[PDB]
From a paper:
In this study, we used PgSGL1, PgSGL2 from [name] and EeSGL1 from Endozoicomonas elysicola as Group 1 proteins; SkSGL from Sanguibacter keddieii, a Gram‐positive bacterium, as a Group 2 protein; [name] and PgSGL4 from [name] as Groups 3 and 4 proteins, respectively. Groups 1 and 3 contained proteins from many marine bacteria, for example, isolated from marine sediment and mudflat environments. Because hydrolytic activities toward β‐1,2‐glucans were detected for PgSGL1, PgSGL2, [name], EeSGL1, SkSGLc, and XcSGL, the general properties of these enzymes were investigated using β‐1,2‐glucan alditols (see Section 4 for details) as substrates. While many of the enzymes showed optimal pH values around neutral pH, the optimal pH values of [name] and XcSGL were 8.5 and 5.0, respectively, which suggests that the optimal pH value varied within the SGL clan. PgSGL1 and [name], single‐domain enzymes, were eluted at the time corresponding to 42 kDa, while the elution time of SkSGLc corresponded to 140 kDa. These results indicated that PgSGL1 and [name] were monomeric enzymes and SkSGL was a dimeric enzyme. Interestingly, [name] (Group 3) produced Sop8 predominantly in the initial stage of the reaction, and then Sop8 was further hydrolyzed (left). When Sop8 was used as a substrate, Sop8 was hydrolyzed to Sop3–5 (right). The five enzymes (Groups 1–3) were clearly identified as SGLs.
Numbering used by the authors: 9 to 428
Write the structure that this text describes.
Amino acid sequence: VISETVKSDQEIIDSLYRGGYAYWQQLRNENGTYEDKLFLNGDRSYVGSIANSGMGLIALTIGHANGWEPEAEQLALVTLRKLAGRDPNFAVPQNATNTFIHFYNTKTGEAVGDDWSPVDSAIMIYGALFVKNYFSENEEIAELADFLYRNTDLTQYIADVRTGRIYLAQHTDGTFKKYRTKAFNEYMLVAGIANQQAKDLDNAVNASNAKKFWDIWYASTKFLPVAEYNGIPVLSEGKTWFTSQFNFLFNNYLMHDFSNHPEFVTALENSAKADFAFWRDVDVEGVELKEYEWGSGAGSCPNGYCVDRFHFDGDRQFNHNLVVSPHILAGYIPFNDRAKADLISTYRDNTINAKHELEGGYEILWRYSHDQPEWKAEFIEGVDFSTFLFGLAAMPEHLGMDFFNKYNNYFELEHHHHHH
Ligand SMILES: [Cl-]
């Protein structure tokens, strides 16, 4: 255990906060694309993620605000021009409905995989709109953001209003894959854009249904499914399982419709209480978690890539390597009283492989396994890692959650809900 004499709580938080931004600085390519994964050894696969352009745009504002990225406005422009197809070296692939491919080659632009992804498209668009707000005097950033927002219609992904279903993905030719996904989850991101587009796009495919969908499932929490963890109500896709915790965090940091809505904020707080309670209920032979260890996330694991979820009464069947996620714990810091202290404790614990150093000596925390304590991650997926910086940045004495609730307000002016 690292003593408070060797390193103070403040020194730890300062290191991790700067480290969380250096991550993004390293994930970013000069051409304004972002790798899917950061390799801790300095390797680069040149496999990019569209989602990480959105998260990286957000991160640029955080670095800027902290004095760590004085070029940020121009880095944001480079990324947005690249996303808009305005760099002649290559464009990111889009399918027959202008949906972006999830992954692509960051040297050549070749598509990678089969996932023409509305959600990853939506994360990119949010990041564009976030930098538009942040660099609000740059007209070219506004124009590019508006172009990206208007040119992928997400109203088409609303599948069935009465059951809360959105199509997961499209095929190359623009038809939908079979799979539908139900509220509550991170497809709130999709719904939100579709709700705005219904108002804003002249030719929205499916405007009325997108509005109706939003009004039932996401204008309030009233109709969302609830699954109870030890009597704690947790929004979910149904009553007998839990969705991913990152869904609450992505929706909160990226969408005003979540972060500015007290029902949704309360839901995120409850969800974090359930994740803590879960980790305290785990009783696996040969494992002993300390009290400060918790957070159910997605990301690299001994099995490759894992989407870890909690389940009733400490049941770890949906957490295949019994991985604990410090990016999720960090993400909770503004929303749970003990998360910050627990993140620090986690850093101090030398029996777990949570600490990682980046090139340049920067420090972060990341996923580690209780089934395989000697495992140490070799890379970090940006979409998941996002919430580490965001949670640290949203500390009250850092930028605060009001930073995100201000700059994620894409669709309203400041006095919208005030007296005229
Ligand atoms: Cl991704």
